[PDB]
Design a protein around this ligand. Structure first.
Ligand SMILES: CC(=O)N[C@@H]1[C@@H](O)[C@H](O[C@@H]2O[C@H](CO[C@]3(C(=O)O)C[C@H](O)[C@@H](NC(C)=O)[C@H]([C@H](O)[C@H](O)CO)O3)[C@H](O)[C@H](O)[C@H]2O)[C@@H](CO)O[C@H]1O
Ligand SMILES: CC(=O)N[C@@H]1[C@@H](O)[C@H](O[C@@H]2O[C@H](CO[C@]3(C(=O)O)C[C@H](O)[C@@H](NC(C)=O)[C@H]([C@H](O)[C@H](O)CO)O3)[C@H](O)[C@H](O)[C@H]2O)[C@@H](CO)O[C@H]1O
Ligand SMILES: CC(=O)N[C@@H]1[C@@H](O)[C@H](O[C@@H]2O[C@H](CO[C@]3(C(=O)O)C[C@H](O)[C@@H](NC(C)=O)[C@H]([C@H](O)[C@H](O)CO)O3)[C@H](O)[C@H](O)[C@H]2O)[C@@H](CO)O[C@H]1O
Lengths: 420, 170, 420, 170, 170, 420
């Protein structure tokens, strides 16, 4: 019941270790260790068989076998129902008292989810057999008065430290395309016809580390870019892209929203591999993927989706609903002021957001024979309640950057209020 | 007496706790003898082949009825029995005397009770092999030992007894 | 070579742990552990095979298989020639000297005996493989002068603590009868015809805890009652007796002696199971077993056999030989004084014992509509040498209770000396 | 960057050192929980059936080429894999708190590099199963834990990295 | 010399004691090396397949004669050999130096002697595998070691020798 | 590259433990043990298979199988490629730092050599799998700057303590003869015809401990005597020699040199077994081996070969090249002075050596009805530079004993300089 700032797709969440069922259903045993004595409980693996626990909201597709394959893509887990890993606990009772040693089997809880438009449509919980838990305490009195107690509710409880690690995986039903040659400063890729049938991922790497602008020729549809987790510093060839079938992906930036006309500004390192996910294009006209290495302080947009705002030639509110970046991340908006350019002529604007809070930076986009350049016009320490207006030259282009500071809703709404 | 329960009328499955040792089985696994500061160690593996449950059924509750109702609410011992588990105890003998310690299996006591008028009318019992427990005493060939040390005439719990229930349905 | 105060039957005696043969026949090995070093010897059970030792005075009947079955009835031993129980010894030598670590296999000695009329007619000794013995001491000098020593005598020696635990078992050749319904305050049981062919045991439980009088309608033959060890607090049904096939029995009270006309007064708890052993009745007339819950201070006879004395209408000594109870236990005698009742009329008596010593209590048996009642007439702190006479009303009935304090002989002789 | 080597032109087999843990495989073997001064122990056996190598070949260097050139200069891991080897770690939980430790396999990183103009042009990588490594942290159900403790996004060496080479011939 | 016994004329079976190490077999099982406070541990299992007896028969006493007469009076080693038994030794290496320890089997020496005129005329010998013994020495690659540490030229007993006899009949 | 003072034959040299290959080829693994934690590496022998390393200069004859058989004759090694011996290392990290634990497999290096006339004609190196090595140290910094390092040279290095134990073995291609009866004070043995085909060994024992003279009837060819290592105090019979097939031999004294006319004076103990190696005799006339127990101080020649000097009837240098005894051992020379005996008449001599240094003792050999006797004439603390001459009675016999103090060459040269 919390906001998950990620694009549509599959995710595997390591929800922590130390999970066990209620009513001692995972109790291995208890030892009464008398003073000056030592007790020990062992899982020697004389048999390597382990018993995983599985729960799914859709048996047909999110089957145990399917879920296991996802866990393999996320964390590369090899053994699901066997183990050669031994665990053992040892305790010595003091000279003054007796000790009670309770030992239980445990599980690591992995959650597999199908996340669509801020919502979970399917869910599976895989409990990977773990290395147990041991509770030692002062031995109870054999005389302690017995208290009738109703059995607890059927279920799990967490015993290990708090953990929540999200890892995205390539959607196995969307194909993967590959740009074999490390891309240079400029590159154009023709999107295959299969795009008409389903979204695909384009795997690639850059020849030179730096910031890049990535987009379709009409800034439509919106793109999403990921990093192949663990891809850096493995096999490498200067003239070819060495694939490692890494299906674990880290979301950098991008949106799913259909009408979100935009392009991406991201930081790319040559020693890594990346995936760009192109939505399904239900059109017969061939689309293209354009890559361009940007020199200049356009890098300030450091890993951001730049939304091009439409219909700015009116007065009042101008809203834009977009999937909100996570706390600390960016989301940008490009504005070409209505009217013709002649330094003097201007219009008054007031920038705000509505669901989520953040820090704003207003840039004046300029041109040079050395690429683009940004000139900071102003900064805003409060966007949810900003009232300070500002005048912008007509026919000029501005980019507003938002750094999310408070994630209250799945979507963040941007408002380019035109006072005049 | 032990048949008075503040429970509604019906059938219940009860977890009486872990740590139960059985009547007169005290020395069935043998004992160990050491001396002069030596460390003695005894251990075991409750392999499925040895660790066998003890059923005490009644008219209303037969072996099958007891098993399914226990493995439904509490730990499924039939499954777990396929995975070998070990335990051991160690103790240092006194500097100038002898140490004797013996081992015996511990159990989880489950009960299937029939209640009528806040009193137990029928009671089935199941002992599921848990782990083990050792008892030790220091000695010399002259010393006289209390026989309660070597013998347990009535089933009992070395830990505090428990009463965790759940009413059976249908 | 000591008195065993028990009725005829079978017994299994745990004679202790740490038994081993002479001349190092059970020596596993010796380790020379040099200073600042640690040594260890282990029985890891890479093989679960163990080798029991057996000796019997009658191979035909008291076979090893038979003996093992008895040991199973007594202590419920499951594994006789296998073990998964590991034992291991560890010792660290001080910085100043060397240590010698000798480790031996051991056995628990169980004795199976056929006890008849104060005598052992058959005997078997079962040596159950145990968990070893370890002797550590200062390492001997390699230069120590070698002393010619003759081998010791072939046999066993005990190394563990002193132990002697007697447990009786149902004689497997005498059948077991069962009184299915918990007996009420009054109950009569017809002894089956099979009684003509051999003794039998009658298994039962009482519906109400309290003291009971148990006997045959003519107080003949004498009965014996046992407790089923471990029978309490297991399966239970208020309308039925739940059997646990417990063949381990604890002798409460009773005699074997044929002419011992008597009845039993015992304390019975409803949560337990009991066995009454009825001797073989070589008669065609059906006998009966009568149970009667006694209210009143007749409970003072707390677990005792009440012997009814015969031929009291003469002067001088009146001896009665009966199997002696153990130190601390009782044996009672009922006396109806010869002559007619008329308060005043009396006769002088002097109570004594001859083989064993004890404490006596003389009771006057009275009647009430609330059952019987006892009135203490006198107590005797010495029965072997009592000379203090006492006058008893003729036609009145007295019960004398003896608490054994010294067990010198299998039989205790009671003497109701009539001075007048 | 990491492709600049002061080496003559040619092909080389390099031992990058022992102690390499792999990306996001941190908790694949499970974790262990203990408390109040109890000693916790976790161990494993790199049996040939589990301990499997990870090959990352390139155009010039295929799986076979990488293996033979490594087993020729350095430890022959194919042979050694037939002999089971164990390792364990133990730690005592704090007196009044909980201890959590998890295990993961370590590896020896081997590399087959193609050098041109003192720069690495091609790089194949091989990870040979070595032993294991445990990480522990003390905690209570309230504490917040740094996720770097549970996750490793990029392959790294827990010991100091190494560069021991030998030029390949023919 | 060693043939003078204060014994009546006849044949005897003698237990010469446990703790016998054999000539030049000192390093047959290998040695172990550690340093800087590390604890080194060496152990073994005298499994029936390895632990093999050494017979040294004479004209009057053949292998069979020796075995039956020993297993008749003393421990029956043929039976016991079916049950695996282990033993181990451990030692901590010095803080700033190296430790070397090697292992070798120990034995029980049995003898079958023919006596005439208070002197041994014939002597058969049997060595029954017992357990093991370790020897350790601290060192540095420069130190010179006494070769008696590594080599035993004549069979001997690390414990005190013994002479426990029993005259053979028929 | 050092002098090996032994006769021709086979030798097995234990060159030490802790041998391992370069470039971590025997590295089992490294553990990073963090502070307050304990780490352990184990060789549990879940598989008893071990992998020996072998190298030979002659595969045809000094095969691995052959070499193993030799190692069995030398040290009686049973298992070459299997082991049930477990080894394990344990280390606890201090509270202040991390520890690095590196563990390697190791080998004991056994060298098999065919030694002929001061030279090694064939050589094999057998590396017996050992019980490992463990190196613990302060954990290195993960940040430590990586240094390019060229791989070391292919080979072995020694990690264990310095050790060099030489053990000779019976040459398996030369037959063994046996003198069944313990030899008395005098004994003559006829050398079999097989001697014409190859050298043989004669196994025997003496009935009485003492010093003996052993030789062929013409003092040719030279003999060599060995002790059967471990032969003492095992099976024994007063009328027969009990063989133990001990093929491990300890060289006492003797030469290989063909023209070395001589006899041996050695100390023999009745509880031991000895081997005399008779060279191949390419003659059809039967030779003999004569044994004679010497009483007297001839025992002073305690384990020595007495070389009979020839051609002493000239002036100047009189050299004699013989295989040099080891430092501390003897080599003697018998001299009968040229000329007839008549107390007074004498000749001047000056004794020296040339390659090796030693201590000399000059004896006057005399006769008695109680055997021989020696009279010390003089001693020399320096033989390499002795100039002190001495006059010897003509027709008299002298024996010069040399105790080697410096072994510079395989051969020691003796010079009986005749000044007159
Ligand atoms: C996943 C996906 O396809 N996106 C879904 C949305 O399309 C869908 O809502 C869409 O709303 C559209 C109109 O909404 C605004 C907005 O952003 O809030 C209305 C603004 O006034 C308008 N801005 C101006 C000043 O013109 C703004 C803007 O045109 C766009 O953001 C593009 O820049 O659109 C429209 O009605 C679509 O038909 C409708 O689908 C939401 C549900 O509301 O679900 C999303 O998953
Ligand atoms: C196991 C069994 O059947 N009992 C055997 C005895 O019956 C047997 O001895 C019996 O002795 C009987 C007579 O003995 C006395 C006695 O108790 O000592 C003699 C007393 O004077 C007499 N008391 C009086 C005053 O009448 C007493 C009494 O009648 C009975 O105890 C009954 O109350 O009997 C008789 O001779 C039997 O024939 C004889 O079997 C003994 C061996 O002596 O062995 C027991 O096993
Ligand atoms: C293994 C074997 O058979 N021995 C080989 C030697 O025989 C061989 O050298 C031999 O040398 C002989 C002559 O050498 C001297 C010597 O000992 O140095 C020369 C001395 O002047 C002579 N002494 C005197 C004063 O007569 C000395 C003496 O005669 C002998 O030692 C016997 O007492 O001999 C001769 O030339 C042989 O033909 C020759 O084989 C050496 C190589 O030089 O190799 C050995 O293996």
């Amino acid at each position: 019941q919390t906001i998950l700032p990620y694009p549509n797709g599959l995710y595997v969440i390591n929800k922590g270790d130390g999970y066990m069922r209620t009513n001692d259903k995972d109790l291995i045993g208890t030892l009464l260790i008398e003073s000056s004595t030592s007790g020990s409980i062992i899982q020697p693996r004389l048999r390597n068989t382990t018993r995983p626990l599985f729960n799914t909201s859709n048996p047909t597709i999110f089957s145990q076998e399917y879920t296991e394959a996802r866990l393999n893509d996320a964390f590369n887990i090899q053994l699901f129902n066997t183990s050669t890993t031994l665990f053992k606990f040892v305790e010595e009772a003091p000279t003054n008292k007796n000790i009670s040693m309770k030992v239980y089997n445990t599980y690591e809880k992995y959650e597999l989810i199908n996340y669509q438009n801020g919502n979970i449509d399917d869910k599976a919980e895989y409990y990977l057999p773990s290395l147990g838990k041991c509770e030692v305490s002062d031995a109870p009195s054999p005389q302690a008065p017995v208290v009738e107690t109703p059995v607890d509710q059927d279920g799990f409880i967490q015993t290990g430290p708090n953990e929540n690690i999200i890892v995205g995986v390539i959607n196995p039903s969307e194909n993967i395309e590959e740009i074999s040659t490390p891309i240079p400063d400029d590159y154009t890729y023709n999107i295959p016809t299969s795009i008409q049938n389903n979204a695909c991922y384009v795997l690639f790497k850059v020849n030179t580390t730096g910031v890049y602008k990535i987009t379709t020729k009409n800034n439509l549809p919106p793109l999403i870019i990921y990093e192949a987790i663990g891809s850096s510093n493995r096999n490498m060839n200067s003239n070819n892209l060495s694939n490692d079938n890494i299906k674990a992906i880290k979301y950098i930036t991008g949106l799913n929203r259909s009408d979100a006309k935009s392009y991406l500004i991201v930081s790319l390192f040559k020693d890594k591999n990346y995936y760009i996910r192109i939505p399904q294009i239900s059109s017969s006209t061939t689309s293209q993927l354009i890559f361009k290495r940007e020199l200049g302080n356009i890098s300030d947009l450091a890993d951001s989706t730049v939304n091009i705002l439409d219909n700015l030639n009116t007065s009042g509110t101008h809203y834009y609903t977009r999937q909100s970046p996570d706390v600390g991340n960016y989301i940008s908006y490009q504005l070409t002021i209505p009217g013709d350019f002649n330094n003097i002529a201007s219009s008054i604007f007031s920038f705000r957001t509505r669901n989520n809070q953040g820090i704003g930076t207003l840039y004046r986009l300029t041109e040079s024979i050395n690429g683009y350049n940004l000139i900071t016009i102003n900064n805003y320490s409060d966007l949810l309640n900003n009232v300070e207006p500002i005048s912008l030259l007509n026919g000029a282009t501005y980019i507003f950057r938002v750094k999310v500071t408070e994630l209250n809703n799945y979507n963040i709404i941007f408002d380019a209020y035109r006072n005049s | 007496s032990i048949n008075n329960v503040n429970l509604a009328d019906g059938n219940y499955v009860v977890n009486r706790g872990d740590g139960w040792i059985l009547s007169r089985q005290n020395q069935n696994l043998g004992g160990n003898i050491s001396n002069n500061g030596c460390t003695a160690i005894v251990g075991d593996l409750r392999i499925r082949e040895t660790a066998t449950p003890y059923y005490y059924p009644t008219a209303s509750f037969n072996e099958e009825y007891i098993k399914n109702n226990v493995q439904n609410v509490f730990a499924n011992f039939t499954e777990a029995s396929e995975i070998p588990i070990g335990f051991e105890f160690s103790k240092t003998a006194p500097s100038n005397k002898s140490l004797y310690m013996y081992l015996q299996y511990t159990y989880i006591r489950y009960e299937i009770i029939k209640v009528l008028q806040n009193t137990v009318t029928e009671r089935a019992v199941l002992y599921v092999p848990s782990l083990g427990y050792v008892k030790s005493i220091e000695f010399n060939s002259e010393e006289q030992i209390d026989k309660n040390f070597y013998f347990t005439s009535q089933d009992k719990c070395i830990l505090n007894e428990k009463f965790i229930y759940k009413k059976i349905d249908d």
